[PDB]
Design a protein around this ligand. Structure first.
Ligand SMILES: Nc1ncnc2c1ncn2[C@@H]1O[C@H](COP(=O)(O)OP(=O)(O)OP(O)(O)=S)[C@@H](O)[C@H]1O
Ligand SMILES: Nc1ncnc2c1ncn2[C@@H]1O[C@H](COP(=O)(O)OP(=O)(O)OP(O)(O)=S)[C@@H](O)[C@H]1O
Ligand SMILES: Nc1ncnc2c1ncn2[C@@H]1O[C@H](COP(=O)(O)OP(=O)(O)OP(O)(O)=S)[C@@H](O)[C@H]1O
Ligand SMILES: Nc1ncnc2c1ncn2[C@@H]1O[C@H](COP(=O)(O)OP(=O)(O)OP(O)(O)=S)[C@@H](O)[C@H]1O
Ligand SMILES: O=C(N[C@H](CO)[C@H](O)c1ccc([N+](=O)[O-])cc1)C(Cl)Cl
Ligand SMILES: O=C(N[C@H](CO)[C@H](O)c1ccc([N+](=O)[O-])cc1)C(Cl)Cl
Ligand SMILES: O=C(N[C@H](CO)[C@H](O)c1ccc([N+](=O)[O-])cc1)C(Cl)Cl
Ligand SMILES: O=C(N[C@H](CO)[C@H](O)c1ccc([N+](=O)[O-])cc1)C(Cl)Cl
Ligand SMILES: O=C(N[C@H](CO)[C@H](O)c1ccc([N+](=O)[O-])cc1)C(Cl)Cl
Ligand SMILES: O=C(N[C@H](CO)[C@H](O)c1ccc([N+](=O)[O-])cc1)C(Cl)Cl
Ligand SMILES: O=C(N[C@H](CO)[C@H](O)c1ccc([N+](=O)[O-])cc1)C(Cl)Cl
Ligand SMILES: O=C(N[C@H](CO)[C@H](O)c1ccc([N+](=O)[O-])cc1)C(Cl)Cl
Ligand SMILES: [Mg+2]
Ligand SMILES: [Mg+2]
Ligand SMILES: [Mg+2]
Ligand SMILES: [Mg+2]
Lengths: 178, 178, 178, 178
């Protein structure tokens, strides 16, 4: 019943982070937020130039090797362990592998009660937001806007194309069982 | 004829910075961007706790003393001097003093050709964006959303309430004389 | 035998973060880094103004309530779980409660093989570094420089007062069993 | 007599920024700080991928085209204009072109009273600091540690190899005529 984890998925610049900060502000109980971004931050800088690490193409492409995956896996188990320990966890991710990515998460989550959230945004609009924020390799937003959701199942879907972050947060919070 | 300076004015979280980065990306010639934020960054940290410096109330209020103003003034003259020297300058400001603030700028600009831009956004929406970005004292957006424009004259007015940054940028760029 | 976790402890501005980035660069296998700072980053912003959250006095003091501790605890278990899952983890912390803080960690770590590192630095020197970095409430460095180590047991002790970060990293890496 | 501008020069990771923040804290009157870094921040993002812009080699090299120089020039005149207007200005730069770079500055400064400061640091030590800060293309520190000072004349020289930032700041402040 009680929601233990909220997992958001969406392409770059779709507005996930904004929603996450809004959720932490809205939800009455403290929710810890982690994502692919905080993970990369925690990983050694050299992981970004390693063969089986993560590579950012000059055109927005993203490649993930086995070195990166092995680490992500251990990190995923720890996040889930935090939840089982009683910490409310929000996860901000980008399912580059679509359904396969969701399956991987299901693999670690087990029978833990999770709220699967889909965060959509039109590719062109996301691209514009990408330009507006100045901190992102041009090309990611467009490349991830749709592929990332293929075959993925959600409990709640919000679209930031015409909805503010705080509004999407309200929509998501209503599905969070205390 | 040729536009030398573009001066944007709007309350916190109205979307100025995003527009500025979009303008720099859109406009063919290189435009340098400076604002009240880069200025505070360049000022000594202690200016933020000084009597006549700048004080950020715990509720979003902002007070500016004479120490801060004297410095801002010299900085304003330098920015204008950069323009007269041939650098295209975009300025991102918050006219806390409404029309009085614009007059001060007119004072430094002289006969330099400037494009005065107004950046509006509904207070409640800006407040939500304030929460979404996690980096801003709650209360500023609402407090500045309207007062900042009172008696101020613009050449172009854009509203981010329902327009993306890149779109407002297109509207502004069209008024920029090469 | 194989070192699973490296736990650094030291006052603010003692140089922990620099050492951590050096360790990640030096150590051949990928090491994930988390600390009290990344934790606060992951916690809701409001935790910083909550009764039992974390409060930063205007003079450098730091208070931690039960709300903050409960969360930290669940986070600690997750970090350890990441280690047991095979991820090499570096932790950057500040034992405000001296020995009591180390005991708490021992509580979560169990029989996991950990490398306890002490990072010292003269109070006055740390204070200067605090001023130099511009991002830290004046007063923390001096307040934490010594109290934080009282009754704490280390496997390796480095002092940044006259040693570069990369050098302290070499000293620490030598004690890391592959 | 009265010092109007303080111009620091030194290779990447030599410790300039730290010194600058210390100077702003130490000096009684408010000093505005600008540098090659704040300039790049103010320049359009695309300047970093333009033919005559600025290019960061994957090995630490830095190339500056005419597009970048033209803008820098106008910016230099504005900074000086700020000084003539009464603002105390600290400048943090990297004289890639050695003496030629200093001549260029002399060109804009004119008869303005300037305090020329040299900030040295051993290449290997700077390289280590480069690794420690995680935010800098590996290779810059070593490449700039010496070449940057060739044929350059200073009023004060400090060396961060064995001196803290706050200490170098004290040495520099003593040469500042009120
Ligand atoms: N609903 C929205 N409408 C307009 N702008 C938005 C909206 N949500 C977020 N933004 C802004 O768009 C930018 C990109 O959104 P982010 O929240 O940073 O996206 P993201 O999902 O974090 O990516 O990480 O993947 S990269 C930020 O600068 C936000 O402030
Ligand atoms: N048109 C927009 N629609 C939705 N979100 C936007 C829009 N423009 C900007 N944002 C986001 O809203 C946040 C606040 O906008 P900013 O551009 O940072 O405002 P601001 O004018 O810079 O302030 O400085 O004053 S504070 C950022 O995180 C942006 O990504
Ligand atoms: N050994 C050192 N000698 C001189 N400066 C250093 C040294 N180690 C770190 N620094 C610098 O001092 C500043 C403070 O050090 P940090 O590594 O940020 O300290 P810290 O342990 O992270 O804190 O978090 O607690 S706050 C940073 O700006 C570093 O670049
Ligand atoms: N005297 C010092 N001893 C030890 N570490 C220092 C010293 N001065 C600065 N540092 C640290 O070394 C790092 C690099 O120094 P910075 O001040 O950032 O160099 P920089 O001159 O700014 O470059 O810009 O060019 S890049 C920072 O993280 C500082 O905290
Ligand atoms: O250390 C490195 N590589 C080897 C293989 O040459 C390695 O197995 C590795 C790759 C990435 C990584 N990380 O993220 O810390 C760690 C080790 C390169 Cl990053 Cl220099
Ligand atoms: O820009 C970055 N990451 C974006 C997402 O924020 C990139 O689009 C990305 C997408 C997926 C990913 N992953 O899950 O493997 C990693 C990075 C990091 Cl360098 Cl901050
Ligand atoms: O130095 C200070 N104050 C005096 C008056 O006590 C001063 O005239 C002043 C205020 C702000 C400032 N600044 O921004 O650098 C400089 C000096 C305080 Cl910030 Cl400690
Ligand atoms: O949050 C900040 N500034 C905002 C504007 O970005 C604040 O609303 C503000 C408004 C006006 C101002 N001024 O022009 O005097 C200074 C700060 C700085 Cl601390 Cl980054
Ligand atoms: O929501 C809040 N407080 C209550 C008590 O009034 C609460 O139990 C709490 C405190 C901190 C916190 N956090 O970090 O998310 C969460 C809830 C205040 Cl932060 Cl407004
Ligand atoms: O400045 C901050 N934290 C410093 C340590 O980096 C503060 O000294 C501190 C010390 C101990 C602590 N804790 O473990 O409870 C939290 C913050 C955060 Cl706001 Cl980034
Ligand atoms: O706009 C661009 N280039 C042309 C030449 O193709 C131009 O003259 C230029 C280069 C850098 C720049 N800047 O920094 O804004 C501006 C224009 C490229 Cl950055 Cl896409
Ligand atoms: O890393 C950067 N700049 C460093 C100096 O901080 C680089 O070494 C550099 C050196 C000289 C320069 N210039 O003056 O032309 C520009 C960048 C910027 Cl991307 Cl923040
Ligand atoms: Mg995100
Ligand atoms: Mg702005
Ligand atoms: Mg640290
Ligand atoms: Mg610098």
């Amino acid at each position: 019943m009680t929601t233990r984890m909220i997992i958001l998925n969406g392409g770059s610049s779709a507005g996930k982070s904004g929603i996450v900060r809004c959720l932490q502000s809205v939800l009455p109980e403290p929710w810890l937020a982690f994502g692919v971004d905080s993970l990369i931050e925690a990983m050694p800088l050299k992981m970004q130039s390693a063969e089986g690490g993560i590579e950012f193409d000059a055109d927005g492409g993203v490649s993930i090797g086995p070195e990166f995956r092995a680490l992500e896996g251990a990190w995923a188990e720890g996040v889930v362990a935090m939840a089982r320990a009683g910490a409310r966890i929000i996860i901000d991710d980008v399912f580059l592998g679509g359904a396969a990515a969701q399956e991987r998460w299901r693999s670690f989550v087990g029978d833990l009660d999770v709220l699967w959230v889909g965060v959509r945004c039109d590719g062109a609009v996301a691209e514009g937001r990408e330009t507006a924020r100045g901190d992102r390799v041009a090309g990611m937003a467009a490349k991830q806007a749709y592929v990332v959701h293929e075959g993925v199942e959600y409990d709640v879907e919000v679209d930031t194309t015409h909805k503010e972050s705080i509004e999407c947060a309200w929509a998501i919070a209503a599905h969070v069982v205390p």
